[PDB]
Write a protein that binds this ligand. Structure first.
Ligand SMILES: Nc1ncnc2c1ncn2[C@@H]1O[C@H](COP(=O)(O)OP(=O)(O)O)[C@@H](O)[C@H]1O
Ligand SMILES: Nc1ncnc2c1ncn2[C@@H]1O[C@H](COP(=O)(O)OP(=O)(O)O)[C@@H](O)[C@H]1O
Ligand SMILES: Nc1ncnc2c1ncn2[C@@H]1O[C@H](COP(=O)(O)OP(=O)(O)O)[C@@H](O)[C@H]1O
Lengths: 73, 508, 68, 502, 508
């Protein structure tokens, strides 16, 4: 249980906590605060994933494997 | 929950900003740009269009609310205010273990009840002069002075009565606005036809051209010098130095063409024939044209040309000769008019007069933009009022009516959505109480008085804004559009939904 | 907005009983429903791919050590 | 918030107390307000010194004290098990379940455990004679506190208890006292009928028949109520005159006050050695260098009572005994008072060892052994220990949780996992990784063997049957340990805020 | 200056501190004294004596709540929550500029309606043992561990049944709870008659005595020729030898007084007179009268003697002498009990045996003190139940019914007191709300559910904490006292006014 796996898990938990509310017919709206000043609304998780900033390399690799998932199906 | 609370707080802040604007007796806001020019506006749509707001979610609320409110006249002030109150009421339970979705479905059920309630609460009244006077009043008084609005009502309603003959929901094809500075603002009147902001260098014109034949083609009575002969400044520019001249003949040739067409269409030199130019025209030949019964005008803008074509016939073209009278129109009176310093020639009583225009005469820019916005609001509101067959009284009347209807509907909706319909009822209650607050009659006292008046009698009763007493809004003459208020409730529910569902702030 | 723990526990208790494997949660109303009765359905292939890719990305991610 | 704080405090208390659980428990340094330093692996002492200032910690500690005063073994089991309850309740609350549901689930799970555990028992204690069998029964308790040298203490405790355990089905807790005279070798310990003392002033025992005892911490007078006679230390010659006087008074005691019950005087304060010589001439012995608890014990076991200051003796505080004689156990003089059940019901052992720290370790071992004998006499059925009973209960509680629909099942499953925490406590102390051994133990235990547990002797995580191995706890001990552990857990969970009052 | 905001915040804080404590399912709280000891409790009476109140007006609310609840004492916590919710809605309505005094007037009108409607909520019946044990159970369970409450409740209803002849309230003289530390509670039932603070024992003494007469003695071995009992005359030899006389002289004379009393009255001590000696006495009396008929008792306090004076007839004559053989008290049965470490004397079937005692016995210190407070509160609640045959359904049922009644009465109330009664109803909503939160339900679905159940039918439905679903509290057996509810409404309204009417909080 080294710190690197803990960081991997923490990044996965953060991104999954962001995405969770987008599941189901009653899914929540999400807020995208582009530092230019505008806001992008979204209902589903792929749209928020395509432009969410992930500075942590673990979350970035999670995004890459999500890209690998979504390109297939 | 923190992001939802932040969004609610920002929406409440902009709600408090817009709180004081609603109602005739309501304090104004005026904007200043980087250049420093002021902009007086109690309107909500242009306000949210032009405001600089520090918050984000406020920005999205303004953008989406104005975009969806433009479709439905002007109601975004009440929209923002009611959604702010609805967010307050939602938070008053979100702090107590309420999940946004159940509150949202409560709002949805309240909306489903409220639309069907307004269906039978709107009164089926025949459109006539008086009801449209009333709706024009209730629109204009929300943007300008009461006496000034009273002045506006006649013109703004009579233009609509003129265009009503088409009996179809068609707008903005005519009834364009016309602006000019003047010493006294009180003068502001409609003009059948169109107004030209210019005249010509015609000393001692037969200004009262009643037999005004019209054919609005561009006549080159000031030929643009042919500087381009063989390109730019090569050695062949010696041709350009001399070919730039000798354009004097074309002016008189075109004038002879106008004289020939004048002879063809009138058979004499008596009846006035009116023609236009996009560019300037010489005065010397205008001296003879005024004697020939020919009225050429210069410096015309673009869209006005086809507007004259649609209102009085004729065609507009840049290439000019003695064109065949295949489209000759006839204005019944080109009322050449001038006051102050500038000549504004009127065109009225066109043959089968299609178009109308509203001459607004604001003294200066910051009042002129205000009067412009007021006229647009009034015209679009009365257009909505003639679009639907029923007009519903306002002044917080139907708002308290549907709030009490939702209170009675509380048991009918099953489950935890009851708080949703309760909060929606309070959001509707914000309107009469905010009118009372803006007028100053201890908003909650007026709210309880109006609810007591409604409950005891069942009559659709509103707030008498100038005295606070509860009064029948139908009898007082306060009318709101059914379409505007329908889309108002739609927008309220939709944006309240959106704001409850958002729960996270993303740095991206 | 339902009882996230209580009603999910009831769903699990139902799933402890045979032939109740179809029993599930109604996302539209937030109550337990025999999802065969609603008629809202879902194919085998997408779920197989979903679980396969989920465990695959878990395996990939928690095996990582991050070194420039 | 305060619930999580209380859980964290009790978690750290149970963690710092857990390392001493099991036979191979880890010692810790103890520095009380007497500033003496010694190493021990006993929950009772380690908590009695440890200032548990957190009120929840104090609650669990006093629950442990109540368990200890009601039943001998399991005082550390209560700490570790309440800690497991609170950690798993913190997990449940982090899931989001309310305190009421978890406490009600713990209550019903405790009721189920108390209902099913009597079915869990595998053997019952035979007759308490046959020192070998009772030694085998004390085996687990004796090994629990001291390891490496264990059979000797079991035999010692067995002999001590059986030599005094009466024919009636009753036995008293304040029976076995300990004497801790220093010297080489633990194995040199022995048991004597009646009470013994470490070492005192020299004397020739004449009270070997019809022994009676007087006890003075006051001037060495001992006059009879019918006369006045005293010693006042102010000048030497008359001091000798008094010494003669109260020696004659001691003779008058052994003559007449013997009928009331005084022959030998117990002196709290030191007396002159020449006065000791006079006592030798006139055939009266005495005892010296006894702590106030020693005087209390000697007087209570004879019916006497220590006098704080000078007062003529009366029958209200006389002591009765059968014999006072002597033995050089461990090559050192020790006095013994022997009884024939006139009062009796007391037996005392001599502790042998080269350090007072090891002396106290032997003392706690003896205390836990005699308390185990207590709880075995009144409840002769007793439970297979060494992790076996905790895991059998854990499996039964898991089955019950799967049997219970709806809520309350979270608390049932976490109560079973609290059972699971006990062989984890054995594993960390025994040098074997907890997860592997607990999983292997489930593998061998869900098969129905029902008597498998953590094998300490194996260097690799493995299991063996504790029944034939001799590792087995008392039924009532574990019953009350779990009962007050769950009571402490449910009471501490029922405190959502810590509030001060004046 | 909204200085009342800090008072509302203090009410919020005290509400939160008193939150989580309602119902059997709710949590309890511990009071760590300055001495470092432990005190577990659940009732708000002693929780409002937690001298770390941390804020002054919170201390005001605490002390006034204790003062106004000491009259009934079944309704103290709930009071804090109702005032907290009244002040929550009051803050919600001050935040719009509304003046608090009309809010207090609305609260007063709401109270006037609520008491009248409560007078109809209450059920009236002859207090049979079943309903009595149900109300005792529902009053005591909200303060004690559930598994242990019932064994107390049976002794409570027995205690209140022992004094049914006359409408007189609870008095300690007929119910004296007595405690001693022990390993297990083990049926902590009452004993009929009186129990002594201690006892005297000797191996020849009698365990049970029947038809025992009783007297007392303040001085029987101490002083001679004087009534004083103080320090001996060590400073005066001439008055000192009388104090060694006294023991012999009175253990002669007064003991022969007792034996001639028992010989003449009983026919040679056939009825076994017993004596309560107030303090220690030479073992000559104790260890020899064990065979001489007499049961000599030792180390008993005075309150025991006045209790037995009321409990046995005659008088506990502190002067020893048996000046009248008919001045004796009488006991029907006597049992020198011994349990755990200590011994105590029971006296039973005495003349006027309506006095009983409670053997509140269990784990040491804090559990014992909590049991003492809980049984005292249960006895006072059952007193409230007996004083008037009126009983109200608890478990939030009465608050739901009152809330609905005030909602229905809301349109009848004139003016902004309509809003006041709305606030009062939404505040009374809190009891179902706190109960539902205590057992960890969604809590906002419980309230809607219970309101829907109370609106569909006329049943007095309340929340059942074991299931959350609405169910009629009447046949479940979760009763409550009508008198404590009346006092609850009165105290709540008066202190909600007295706290909401603060303005410009200033130091003294
Ligand atoms: N003379 C009046 N008396 C009372 N209420 C009025 C009057 N005129 C307008 N109102 C109220 O103003 C409300 C809407 O006005 P407002 O939202 O400010 O216009 P807009 O949205 O176009 O900026 C209506 O509900 C109407 O009842
Ligand atoms: N030989 C053993 N092998 C495994 N576990 C043991 C053994 N002896 C004792 N134990 C465990 O230790 C418990 C009792 O010892 P412990 O709790 O550590 O100290 P105490 O008896 O003073 O409370 C027993 O309940 C049992 O679970
Ligand atoms: N068995 C029960 N089930 C549900 N609610 C109960 C039960 N017993 C009491 N209550 C409710 O709990 C409240 C009474 O307890 P409580 O307010 O804590 O008394 P106190 O003022 O002495 O602290 C009442 O609102 C009552 O309706």
């Amino acid at each position: 249980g080294r710190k690197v796996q803990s960081g991997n898990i923490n990044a996965a938990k953060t991104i999954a906590d962001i995405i969770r509310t987008c599941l189901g017919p009653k899914s929540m709206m999400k807020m995208l605060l582009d530092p230019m000043g505008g806001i992008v609304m979204t209902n589903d998780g792929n749209a928020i994933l395509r432009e969410i900033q992930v500075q942590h390399p673990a979350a970035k690799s999670m995004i890459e494997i999500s890209r690998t998932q979504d390109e297939e199906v | 929950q923190a992001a939802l609370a932040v969004n609610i707080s920002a929406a409440r802040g902009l709600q408090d900003v817009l709180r004081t604007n609603l109602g005739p007796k309501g304090t104004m806001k005026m904007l200043v740009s980087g250049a420093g020019d002021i902009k007086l506006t109690k309107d909500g749509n242009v306000l949210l269009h032009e405001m600089q707001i520090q918050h984000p979610t406020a920005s999205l609320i303004a953008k989406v609310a104005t975009a969806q409110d433009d479709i439905t006249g002007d109601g975004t002030t009440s929209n923002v205010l009611i959604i702010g109150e609805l967010l307050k009421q939602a938070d008053l339970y979100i702090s107590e273990g309420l999940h946004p979705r159940i509150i949202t479905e409560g709002f949805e059920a309240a909306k489903e009840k409220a639309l069907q309630f307004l269906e039978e609460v709107k009164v089926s009244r025949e459109m006539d002069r008086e009801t449209l006077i009333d709706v024009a009043r209730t629109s204009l008084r929300t943007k300008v002075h009461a006496e000034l609005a009273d002045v506006l009502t006649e013109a703004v309603v009579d233009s609509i009565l003129a265009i009503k003959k088409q009996d179809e929901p068609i707008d903005l094809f005519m009834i364009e606005i016309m602006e000019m500075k003047h010493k006294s603002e009180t003068d502001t009147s409609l003009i059948r036809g169109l107004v030209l902001d210019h005249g010509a260098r015609h000393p001692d014109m037969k200004k009262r051209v009643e037999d005004a034949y019209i054919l609005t083609c561009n006549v080159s009575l000031e030929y643009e010098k042919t500087e381009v002969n063989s390109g730019f400044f090569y050695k062949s520019a010696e041709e350009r130095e001399k070919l730039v001249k000798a354009e004097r003949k074309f002016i008189e040739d075109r004038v002879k063409k106008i004289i020939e067409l004048k002879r063809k269409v009138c058979g004499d030199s008596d009846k006035g024939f009116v023609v236009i130019n996009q560019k300037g025209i010489d005065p010397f030949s205008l001296d003879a044209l005024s004697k020939e019964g020919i009225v050429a005008l210069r410096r015309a803008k673009r869209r006005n040309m086809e507007r004259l074509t649609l209102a009085c016939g004729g065609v507009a073209l840049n290439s000019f000769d003695d064109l065949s009278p295949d489209c000759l129109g006839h204005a019944g009176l080109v009322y050449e008019y001038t006051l102050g310093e500038e000549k504004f020639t009127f065109i009225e009583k066109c043959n089968n007069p299609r178009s109308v225009t509203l001459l607004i005469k604001g003294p200066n820019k910051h009042t002129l933009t205000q009067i412009k916005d007021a006229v647009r609001d009034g015209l679009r509101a009365v257009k909505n009022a003639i679009d639907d067959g029923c007009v519903v009284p306002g002044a917080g009347a139907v708002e308290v009516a549907m709030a009490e209807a939702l209170i009675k509907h509380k048991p009918s909706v099953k489950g935890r959505a009851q708080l949703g319909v309760q909060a929606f009822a309070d959001a509707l209650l914000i309107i009469p109480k905010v009118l009372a607050q803006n007028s100053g009659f201890d908003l909650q006292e007026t709210l309880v008085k109006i609810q007591a008046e409604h409950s005891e009698s069942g009559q659709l009763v509103g707030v008498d804004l100038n005295t606070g007493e509860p009064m029948v809004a139908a009898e007082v003459g306060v009318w709101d559009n059914y379409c505007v208020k329908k889309q108002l409730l739609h927008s309220c529910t939709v944006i309240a939904t959106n704001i409850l569902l958002v729960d996270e702030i993303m740095r991206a | 907005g339902a009882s996230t723990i209580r009603l999910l526990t009831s769903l699990r208790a139902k799933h402890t009983q045979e032939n109740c494997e179809t029993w599930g949660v109604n996302g539209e109303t937030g109550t337990l429903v025999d999802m065969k009765e609603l008629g809202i359905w879902e194919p085998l292939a997408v779920k197989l791919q979903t679980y396969k890719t989920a465990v695959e990305t878990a395996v990939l991610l928690l095996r990582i050590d991050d070194i420039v | 918030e305060a619930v999580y704080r209380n859980i964290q405090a009790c978690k750290e208390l149970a963690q710092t107390t857990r390392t001493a659980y099991g036979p191979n428990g880890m010692n810790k340094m103890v520095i009380n307000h007497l500033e003496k330093l010694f190493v021990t692996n006993d929950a009772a002492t380690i908590l009695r010194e440890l200032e548990v200032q957190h009120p929840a910690a104090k609650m669990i500690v006093m629950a442990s004290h109540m368990q200890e005063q009601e039943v001998g073994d399991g005082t550390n089991f209560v700490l570790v098990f309440a800690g497991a309850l609170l950690e798993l309740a913190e997990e449940l609350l982090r899931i989001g379940l309310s305190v009421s549901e978890v406490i009600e689930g713990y209550e019903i799970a405790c009721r189920k455990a108390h209902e099913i555990l009597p079915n869990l028992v595998c053997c019952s204690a035979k007759n308490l004679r046959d020192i070998d069998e009772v030694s085998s029964l004390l085996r687990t308790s004796i090994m629990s506190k001291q390891y490496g040298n264990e059979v000797f203490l079991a035999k010692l405790i067995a002999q001590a208890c059986v030599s005094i355990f009466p024919d009636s089905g009753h036995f008293n807790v304040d029976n076995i006292r300990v004497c801790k005279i220093l010297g080489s070798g633990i194995s040199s310990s022995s048991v004597l009928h009646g009470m013994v003392f470490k070492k005192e002033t020299e004397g020739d025992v004449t009270s070997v028949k019809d022994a009676k005892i007087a006890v003075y911490s006051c001037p060495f007078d001992g006059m009879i109520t019918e006369t006045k006679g005293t010693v006042l230390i102010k000048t030497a010659e008359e001091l000798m005159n008094f010494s003669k006087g109260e020696e004659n008074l001691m003779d008058a005691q052994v003559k007449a006050i013997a009928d009331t019950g005084a022959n030998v005087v117990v002196t709290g304060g030191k007396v002159a050695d020449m006065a000791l010589h006079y006592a030798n001439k006139y055939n009266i012995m005495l005892v010296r260098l006894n702590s106030k608890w020693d005087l209390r014990r000697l007087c209570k076991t004879v019916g006497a009572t220590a006098l704080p200051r000078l007062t003529p003796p009366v029958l209200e505080e006389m002591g009765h005994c059968d014999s006072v004689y002597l033995s050089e156990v461990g090559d050192t003089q020790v006095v013994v008072f022997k009884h024939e059940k006139e009062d009796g019901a007391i037996s005392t052992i001599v502790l042998r060892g080269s350090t007072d720290n090891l002396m106290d370790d032997i003392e706690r071992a003896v205390d836990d052994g005699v308390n185990t004998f207590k709880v075995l006499t009144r409840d002769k059925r007793l439970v297979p220990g060494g992790g076996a009973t905790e895991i059998e209960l854990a499996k039964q509680i898991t089955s019950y949780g799967e049997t219970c629909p709806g809520l309350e099942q979270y608390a049932i499953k976490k109560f079973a996992e609290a059972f699971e925490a006990i062989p984890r406590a054995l594993a960390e102390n025994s040098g074997v990784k907890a997860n592997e051994v607990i999983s292997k133990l489930y593998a061998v235990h869900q098969e129905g063997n029902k008597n498998v547990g953590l094998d300490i002797e194996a260097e690799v995580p493995a299991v063996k049957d504790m029944l034939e191995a001799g590792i087995l706890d008392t039924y009532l001990g574990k019953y009350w340990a779990i009962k007050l552990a769950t009571n402490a857990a449910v009471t501490v969970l029922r405190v959502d805020q810590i509030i001060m009052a004046k």
